[PDB]
Amino acid sequence: SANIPRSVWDPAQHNPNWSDSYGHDITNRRAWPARKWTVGLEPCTPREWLQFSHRNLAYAYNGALRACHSLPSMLLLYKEMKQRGVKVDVDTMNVLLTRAARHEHIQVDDVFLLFDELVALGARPDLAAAETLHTVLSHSASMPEEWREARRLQLVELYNNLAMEEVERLAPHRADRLLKEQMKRF
Amino acid sequence: LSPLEVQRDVGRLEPIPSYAGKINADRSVFPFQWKTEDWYEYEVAKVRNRRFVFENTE
């Protein structure tokens, strides 16, 4: 054929996907900012990756949550941790639902919506949570009746699932007194 | 509950993995257990045959 192939010098054979030399290598050495979020650092080095997890990020964010004294400042942090996928906890649920139920102007509707959404993300409801929900269901006489009964039905469901789960937990240990107490509370 | 269906996070509820109680148990499949004669023969064969390759094939 030819000693220098057409592909090299002929513009008909120009390859549009090739890029110039300087661009890729400039783009490559870029180290983007490690603090992309509040609460954490994005791992950079393999060593840093061994310190990292979504499930532990839960812990750090829970702390940062217990810190905020007002619901509004908490909501932001929560939105973040929801968005960057962070495994969410019983504890995220406890510290959210408490400070939503104390916050004076909350529509009870949204407290329950929020609970529901936390559970959709796979937080395991527990006694504290259910009980707080219960307290919110008492302080609302202002809602439609069917709403109150819907949420009461869901709450009873919840307390029963809890009681079962907790019997299974305590039974193999021959805990009888303690188990009996927990049942007394349920 | 099979050990994979048990919920071990005190703070979460995770979706049960799709292989949890499903994969069944045949000693023919696993765990790997085998005769020594056959193992020897296998290993040696595999060394002796490194160069029997037809590269150029249709």
């Binding site: 812990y59 906890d89 504890d91 | 005190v10 703070g11």
Partner: peptide, 14 residues
């Protein structure tokens, strides 16, 4: 106590 405490701190350690 915090579910975190009972996940990570409920084991024997130094």
């Amino acid at each position: 106590t915090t579910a975190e405490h009972k996940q990570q701190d409920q084991f024997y350690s130094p």
